[PDB]
Write a protein that binds this ligand. Structure first.
Ligand SMILES: CCCCCCCCCCCCCCCCCC(=O)OC[C@H](COP(=O)(O)OCCN)OC(=O)CCCCCCCCCCCCCCCCC
Ligand SMILES: CCCCCCCCCCCCCCCCCC(=O)OC[C@H](COP(=O)(O)OCCN)OC(=O)CCCCCCCCCCCCCCCCC
Ligand SMILES: CCCCCCCCCCCCCCCCCC(=O)OC[C@H](COP(=O)(O)OCCN)OC(=O)CCCCCCCCCCCCCCCCC
Ligand SMILES: CCCCCCCCCCCCCCCCCC(=O)OC[C@H](COP(=O)(O)OCCN)OC(=O)CCCCCCCCCCCCCCCCC
Ligand SMILES: CCCCCCCCCCCCCCCCCCCC
Ligand SMILES: CCCCCCCCCCCCCCCCCCCC
Ligand SMILES: CCCCCCCCCCCCCCCCCCCC
Ligand SMILES: CCCCCCCCCCCCCCCCCCCC
Lengths: 102, 295, 314, 480, 100, 160
């Protein structure tokens, strides 16, 4: 359609002009103007928790856009999914996995 | 028997002992060679750091907080030994702001040393002038009249309010709230208006004299004092209800670096910390001076 | 070559370019506006001497950052150093690229929408990490890992806070979301979703009170790119919560763009007031609040939203 | 499709083991109690094992577009649950000497058993893939549970890297198979092909990559080199689970895939599987000739026994008693491996620190552990296919299935590999009954001893009287 | 009008590139990177196959594939952290003690 | 739509080739992120909008974030001082093996029936419908798989 190809061209022009704007800004900044330890594993733990719960979040993302088309049995399935998610979260909290302080 | 008998005011590569009588008090001739050598020493300090000359022992990270610090209490360096986030050991590197005030005490007259007493702690002013002039009056056999005592108490309490407003603002800004420092600096401006009217200066008045004060109170000072006394309490209540009762500030503050009366006594801690440990020891009540018994 | 299809193509391209220029100029103009409004909150004026009302302060700052000596650290990774402000600008700019500001005024009427916003947040974390690592400083690196751990702790429930609005709308499209608020704005049913998304949006933008800095080695115009990138992120998050929780352009009397601009201006002023009012919590408190309170709140909110929707389905 | 309450009744072991995972999770979150969490795990596994009876009374039909519950699935679920229960029983005295957290072990065992049940009931490529991952990833944790120990960490790294590679190979195979057929169900793989064009190139390539992944999972040559290292480095109850339950579940789902898919009758896949089975039998017996260590010897034993199982699988389309042979052989192999690895686990328990050696020293075991030595030599005779043992009944079934389908190269391979196995198994037995120069007291250690004792008694009784096992395997008949 | 053959060829190219990176690199981190490349290529192949048949099954299998990929990346990076903690190097040829 | 698919595939191939031949770990992860963005563009060109969205959100927004986190943790060290993988005696053999396998897989691919991918956009609503319909147990046991990975990675990746 003409409207969808107009929106595609608008999005492409938006991306190109934004990239060109920031690149030209950096180029003008460079051109103008004269010249003259072992980290603690809690970082890995919190990033790993973010990865796992982001995958669980993607499952809930897929569920949320089709809640009406899934019916009450989909609600029961997603309630079991969310309950397992919350049991894992309670497990992580209670063993001090999510406690940054010692 | 001292554990680490090392220099604390001068750098470690210093020759002589400055407070001796045969040590020349005046500034030595500046040399770019010594500045370059000390810059190289500061650059290779992190490369050749040995945690044995600093009094420390023993995944243990080593970090330097200073020497420059983006705050209003000065610029000083702390060497931190860290287990993750926990602090295992820490020694402070001080003496970065050593002005040789006692050596200047051996170089000025009794009268011309008062401006130097002003700049010992620069939030106090006349509060810093007061013990010096009282000690000189003890040496001189001077019993000052009652109006002198009342005027000196006035200025000491005004500067105490100024310093406490600065301290509360600095603490609140260190917690993370940014507005009460602006408001309490307006309050400090009111105090400075009164102090400028009386003494002629803002933060280093040098107005106390041996036997009294430099001038009489100017005609009209009571109006400025009444204006400040009407201004202050509503602003203080606003500061309390806006920042000091904030639960985030309480969580950042309560239970942080607590100690009892034994630790305050064994370390010479005086002032608000000692009285926060429950020990009722204020100099103005225990050993009264300058007619503080009449208030 | 005069054809109405080409006319519509150029009209849509011009509208997208106008939206881009307006949002970038708004980010810069309210860098200056944050300075002025912090002055207003702190009982002073702020910059009001460079031009009428201080409006030329931004131009002077722009020129100063342009003609400042460009300096890359000698022992640093040049490509990552240049790439971090690149991402910190473009990620939230493309996040704004899906916001509908008016009926017919939208850059991309995508079928994903807030999913594209989630992609842009997942690149903004890269911007922060690359800025920290490329500086070749250990203090900056530690500060960057702490800040990125915070933004992961709040990105973990940003999408789940949006999922209540998505569930009520039944679609990922932003126009469907603003059309589902024809009767009642989503702030009323999705109030817990509103507070969780507001907290997460403030936290992933690294704004107060969620802020060994990793910007200390950055100077010249790269620091300006970081500044305008954070401000564009503020504008983008404000416009997104206007469209998602406050109807967007819907209003009874004023024109729809005026309503959208007024709601966005109120929320950006709320950002300024949030900076001026709250103190900083401790880092462990911030992550514990993100992991122990807000994520279960989003999950329970999604469950309650689904139960309410399926009850109303006859 | 929708799920009926009868479907939930047919999914009873899955729901029970998952609820046990959640309950053990919340019990660890409440208070770290080793005994209570182990008791909850074994109670959940026993509840699933006894709910298999309600599953049997439910019937045999299709619970999902993904699962099919039949007697085959019931038998394989029972074998997986028995292996998991024995793994927990051997794991408790070993974990009694473990200084770090002990409760995560039973959670990982429960999730791996859940994956085994998934693979038992699998009727779909998605279910096959998810069951393999649900088995493998708790095995990643359990193999390197004692990660402070150098060998356990090394085995964990090797198993994780190689199993991720095999999962990628398998996933690419299902991707090519789905690109060809257009359906991921087992019955619709090669269904659209006709007129003798069953050997589609893309379908054969996808099945070859899936054979690569599953042959890693079944320790088949040439995807077998991981097996002695991972078996040796892992903790002994983990080696028990990895030898029994993982192999049983993966071979059951491979049996379902080759029974249901019309492309399982392809001549090229049959010849490739024959080559893999021949090389697996011969290589696994030949590499165990000079093995002093018992774990590596049992790994090569697993390679050879899975080769015999593959020989039984090749004749699936020819003889209708191939499923009977696989079931009887897998019951016998399960009990023999449970006994052998339980003897190893009981003599390796408690865990004597990460910095100390875990050498077995089976020489002269009879003079201080006589019942363990008797059980261990019964298991070594059973794995050799010597009569009066159930392993002989399984090997007789394999030989009968190979003779019926005229797989004469495979029959000769079984005979030669059986002779080599006789050599090293009898070497282990006489080393048990020799003399040794040099070199418990709780009811869980006694429970592990009871488990290996009933395993040995079952091996002997069903070696001299196999007909009850034959009848219960004939009851485990799937959908046609 | 995009051929299924071209998408499968692209996925196969990425798969064999990930396998080559997994084999030729002694660093465990690059081995994990190669593993991520292979599993992402397999997921891409499933997406291509699902898009050819007009079915959501390819995207469902993509979702399962990336769930597996996230979990194995977490496990492998934890194992890599333990290896770097107790060996101070990531040479995978150094861990070869059990043999024969 | 064809041009976008081919340019994104070419970018992904080139970026993967730069990944498996690079020395700097952060640079290799950066080209890996570029390759993941390219493969997401491939997904968007084929109508798999949800798959590309998850490719940027999860694969190029969580997993490689974790890789970058671990690389910054290691502070990467006898790696650039060896360069053993670029000597031909190490890499010619595996490259030959991978080329042979690629040739075999491509030959198997070329003998298939192709009606062409129409690129009809498949929304996340249909994926969510089939996710909680025909694939209920896939979702539940994938939650259990993520739980298993969480427990394993917590048990291994501690410091004590
Ligand atoms: C250089 C890039 C040039 C522009 C590329 C094309 C942009 C338009 C586009 O991607 O359109 C395709 C699709 C349309 O989606 P929609 O209209 O909702 O679908 C209805 C069916 N026609 O829209 C989409 O698929 C949108 C999702 C992909 C958008 C990618 C944008 C760049 C992302 C990476 C940025 C990295 C920054 C650092
Ligand atoms: C686009 C426009 C967006 C503009 C911004 C709008 C939204 C702003 C969101 C700001 C979010 C700030 C979140 C701060 C969380 C802090 C959590 C925490 O741990 O606080 C610590 C404190 C004490 O906790 P405790 O564990 O007891 O510590 C004692 C240990 N010594 O715990 C407490 O004090 C408990 C309470 C913590 C904070 C609760 C949430 C407050 C949210 C901010 C106020 C919002 C006001 C309304 C805004 C407009 C709405 C229309
Ligand atoms: C090292 C020790 C192990 C040695 C290797 C293991 C054993 C190898 C056995 C090889 C058998 C080769 C058979 C060759 C012909 C096969 C095809 C054929 O023509 O089969 C004929 C027939 C099937 O056709 P049908 O229509 O059923 O005819 C009925 C026949 N009355 O076929 C039948 O009906 C059944 C034919 C059975 C043939 C006998 C098989 C076992 C014989 C004993 C063992 C082998 C010989 C002795 C040892 C040799 C040296 C080691
Ligand atoms: C170097 C810079 C990046 C170059 C690669 C990406 C851009 C390639 C050129 C795309 C131009 C737009 C285009 O061809 O759009 C076609 C299609 C539109 O979508 P659809 O509605 O399905 O098309 C049918 C129309 N009725 O578009 C689509 O279906 C999707 C378009 C591609 C996906 C979005 C952009 C991905 C960018 C990845 C960047 C990776 C890092 C560099
Ligand atoms: C912070 C706000 C950022 C907005 C970015 C986009 C601006 C688009 C401007 C469109 C103006 C015309 C809208 C349609 C007509 C209705 C309003 C007419 C009076 C302005
Ligand atoms: C053939 C099937 C298995 C039959 C039983 C095998 C043996 C089981 C253990 C029985 C007890 C063995 C006792 C051996 C004593 C040896 C004493 C030697 C003295 C020099
Ligand atoms: C080392 C392994 C040797 C195995 C020999 C197996 C011999 C089988 C002969 C089969 C002949 C079939 C003829 C038709
Ligand atoms: C220190 C030990 C290092 C061991 C490295 C092992 C590398 C193995 C490389 C194998 C290369 C094979 C090349 C192709 C061979 C011919 C084709 C396959 C067989 C038909």
């Amino acid at each position: 359609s003409t409207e969808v190809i107009a929106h595609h061209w608008a999005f492409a022009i938006f991306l190109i002009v934004a990239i060109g704007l920031c690149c030209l800004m950096l180029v003008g900044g460079w051109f103008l103007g004269g010249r003259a330890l072992r980290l603690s594993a809690k970082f890995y733990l919190v990033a790993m928790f973010f990865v796992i719960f982001d995958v669980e979040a993607l499952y809930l993302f897929a569920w949320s856009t089709s809640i009406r088309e899934s019916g009450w049995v989909g609600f029961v399935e997603a309630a079991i999914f969310i309950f397992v998610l919350l049991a894992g979260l309670v497990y992580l909290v209670r063993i001090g996995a999510l406690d940054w302080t010692p | 028997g001292h554990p680490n008998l090392r220099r604390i005011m001068m750098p470690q590569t210093w020759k002589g002992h400055p407070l001796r009588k045969d040590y020349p008090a005046r500034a030595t001739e500046f040399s770019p060679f010594e500045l370059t050598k000390a810059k190289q020493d500061l650059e290779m300090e992190a490369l050749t750091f040995k945690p044995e000359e600093w009094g420390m022992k023993r995944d243990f990270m080593f970090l330097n907080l200073g020497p420059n610090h983006p705050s209003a209490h000065g610029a000083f360096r702390i060497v931190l030994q860290l287990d993750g986030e926990e602090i295992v050991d820490c020694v402070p590197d001080i003496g970065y702001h050593h002005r040789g005030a006692e050596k200047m005490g051996e170089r000025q007259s009794w009268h011309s040393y008062i401006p130097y007493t002003d700049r010992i702690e620069y939030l106090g002013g006349c509060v810093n002038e007061m013990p010096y002039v009282l000690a000189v009056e003890k040496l001189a056999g001077i019993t000052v009249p009652d109006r002198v005592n009342v005027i000196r108490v006035m200025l000491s309490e005004l500067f105490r309010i100024n310093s406490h407003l600065l301290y509360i603002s600095t603490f609140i800004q260190d917690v993370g709230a940014m507005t009460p420092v602006f408001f309490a600096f307006t309050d400090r401006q009111k105090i400075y208006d009164l102090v400028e009217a009386i003494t002629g200066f803002r933060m280093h008045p040098a107005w106390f004299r041996i036997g009294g004060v430099a001038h009489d109170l100017p005609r009209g000072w009571d109006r400025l004092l009444r204006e400040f006394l009407d201004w202050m309490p509503k602003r203080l209540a606003s500061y309390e209800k806006a920042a000091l009762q904030n639960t985030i500030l309480k969580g950042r503050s309560q239970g942080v670096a607590a100690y009892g009366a034994k630790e305050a006594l064994e370390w010479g801690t005086t002032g608000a910390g000692l009285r926060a440990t429950g020990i009722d020891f204020d100099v103005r009540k225990a050993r009264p001076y300058s007619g503080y018994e009449n208030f | 070559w005069i054809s109405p299809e080409l006319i519509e193509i150029l009209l849509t391209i011009l509208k997208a370019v106008v939206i881009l220029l307006v949002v970038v100029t708004c980010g810069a103009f309210m860098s200056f506006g944050e300075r002025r409004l912090l002055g207003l909150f702190q009982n002073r004026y702020g910059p009001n001497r460079v031009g009428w009302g201080g409006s030329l302060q931004l131009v002077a700052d722009m020129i100063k950052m342009f003609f400042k000596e460009d300096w890359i650290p000698k022992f640093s990774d040049r490509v990552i150093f240049t790439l971090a402000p690149m991402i910190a600008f473009t990620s939230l700019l493309l996040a704004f690229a899906i916001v509908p500001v008016s009926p017919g005024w939208v850059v991309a009427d995508l079928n994903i929408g807030i999913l594209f916003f989630l992609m842009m947040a997942g690149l903004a974390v890269y911007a922060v990490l690359f800025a920290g690592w490329s500086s070749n400083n250990k203090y900056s690196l530690l500060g960057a890992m702490r800040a990125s751990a915070q933004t992961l702790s709040y990105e973990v429930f940003l999408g789940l806070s949006l999922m209540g609005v998505v569930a009520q709308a039944g679609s990922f499209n932003m126009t469907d979301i603003v059309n589902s608020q024809a009767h009642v704005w989503n702030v009323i049913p999705q109030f817990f979703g509103f507070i969780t998304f507001a907290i997460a949006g403030v936290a992933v933008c690294h704004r107060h009170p969620f802020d060994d800095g990793y910007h200390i080695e950055y100077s010249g115009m790269k620091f300006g790119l970081f500044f305008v990138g954070e401000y564009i992120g503020i504008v983008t998050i404000s416009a997104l919560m206007v469209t998602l929780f406050f109807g967007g352009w819907q209003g009874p009397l004023l024109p729809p763009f005026i309503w959208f601009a007024l709601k966005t201006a109120f929320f950006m002023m709320m950002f300024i007031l949030i900076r001026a009012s709250l103190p900083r919590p401790r880092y462990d408190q911030v992550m514990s609040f993100g992991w122990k309170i807000c994520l279960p709140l989003t999950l329970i909110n999604l469950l309650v939203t689904a139960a309410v929707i399926l009850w109303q389905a006859q | 499709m929708t799920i009926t309450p009868q479907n939930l009744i047919a999914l009873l072991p899955l729901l029970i083991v998952g609820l046990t995972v959640v309950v053990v999770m919340l019990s660890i979150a409440w208070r770290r109690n080793h005994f209570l969490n182990a008791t909850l795990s074994v109670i959940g596994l026993n509840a699933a094992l006894v709910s298999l009876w309600f599953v049997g009374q439910a019937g045999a039909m299709d619970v999902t577009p993904l699962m099919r519950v039949d007697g085959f699935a019931m038998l394989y679920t029972g074998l997986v649950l028995l292996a998991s229960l024995a793994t927990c029983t051997f794991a408790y005295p070993w974990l009694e000497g473990y200084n770090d957290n002990k409760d995560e072990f039973y959670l990982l065992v429960l999730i791996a058993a859940l994956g085994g049940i998934l693979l038992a009931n699998a009727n779909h490529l998605a279910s096959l893939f998810l069951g393999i991952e649900l088995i493998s990833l708790p095995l990643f944790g359990l193999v390197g549970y004692a990660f402070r120990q150098k060998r356990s960490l090394e085995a964990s790294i090797k198993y994780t890297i190689l199993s991720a590679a095999a999962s990628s190979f398998l996933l690419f195979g299902m991707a090519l198979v789905y690109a060809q057929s257009g359906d991921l169900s087992f019955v619709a793989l090669g269904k659209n092909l006709g007129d003798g064009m069953l050997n589609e190139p893309l379908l054969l390539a996808g099945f070859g990559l899936m054979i690569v992944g599953l042959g890693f999972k079944l320790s088949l040559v040439p995807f077998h080199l991981w097996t002695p290292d991972v078996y040796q480095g892992a903790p002994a109850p983990v080696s028990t689970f990895l030898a029994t339950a993982s192999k049983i579940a993966i071979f059951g789902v491979v049996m379902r895939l080759f029974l249901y898919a019309p492309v399982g009758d392809s001549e090229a896949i049959r010849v490739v599987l024959a080559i893999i089975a021949f090389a697996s039998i011969i290589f696994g017996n030949l590499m165990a000739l000079s093995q002093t260590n018992i774990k590596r010897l049992l790994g090569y034993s697993s390679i050879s026994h899975l080769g015999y199982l593959l020989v039984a699988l090749i004749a699936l389309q020819t003889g209708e008693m191939s499923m009977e042979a696989v079931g009887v052989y897998l019951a016998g192999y399960l009990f023999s491996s449970l006994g052998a690895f339980g003897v190893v686990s009981l003599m390796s328990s408690p865990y004597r620190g990460p910095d100390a050696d875990s050498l077995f020293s089976y020489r002269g075991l009879f003079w201080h552990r006589p019942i363990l030595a008797a059980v261990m030599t019964v298991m070594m005779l059973s794995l050799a296919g010597i009569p009066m043992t159930l392993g002989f009944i399984g090997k007789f079934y394999v030989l009968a299935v190979g003779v019926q389908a005229h797989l004469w190269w495979l029959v000769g391979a079984v005979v030669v590999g059986s002779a080599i196995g006789l050599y090293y198994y009898l070497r282990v037995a006489v080393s048990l009954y020799l003399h040794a120069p040099e070199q418990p007291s709780n009811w869980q250690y006694s429970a592990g001893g009871i488990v290996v004792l009933i395993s040995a008694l079952l091996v002997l009784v069903l070696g001299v009287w196999p007909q009850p096992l034959i009848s219960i395997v004939r009851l485990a008949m799937p959908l046609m | 009008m995009i051929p299924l053959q071209h998408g499968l060829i692209l996925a196969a190219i990425l798969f064999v590139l990930g396998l080559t990176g997994l084999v030729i690199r002694r660093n465990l981190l690059f081995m994990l990177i190669g593993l991520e490349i292979m599993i992402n290529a397999s997921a891409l192949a499933f997406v291509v196959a699902g898009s050819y048949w007009g079915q959501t099954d390819g995207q469902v299998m993509y979702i399962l594939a990336i769930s597996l990929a996230a979990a194995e990346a977490s496990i492998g990076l934890a194992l890599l952290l333990q290896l770097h903690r107790r060996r101070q190097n990531l040479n995978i040829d150094s861990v070869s003690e059990m043999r024969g | 739509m064809e041009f976008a698919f081919y340019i994104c595939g070419l970018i992904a191939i080139l970026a993967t080739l730069r990944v498996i031949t690079h020395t700097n770990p952060v640079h290799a992860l950066l080209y890996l992120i570029i390759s993941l963005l390219a493969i997401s563009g491939v997904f968007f060109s084929l109508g798999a909008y949800f798959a590309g969205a998850l490719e940027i959100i999860v694969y190029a927004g969580a997993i490689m974030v974790l890789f970058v986190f671990v690389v910054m943790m290691l502070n990467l060290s006898e790696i650039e001082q060896e360069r053993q993988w670029l000597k031909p005696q190490v890499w010619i053999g595996p490259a030959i093996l991978s080329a042979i396998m690629l040739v075999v897989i491509v030959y198997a691919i070329l003998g298939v029936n192709d009606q062409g991918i129409d690129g009809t956009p498949i929304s996340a609503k249909a994926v969510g419908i089939t996710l909680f319909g025909p694939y209920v147990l896939a979702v539940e046991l994938a939650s259990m798989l993520l739980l298993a990975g969480l427990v394993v990675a917590f048990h291994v990746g501690r410091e004590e």
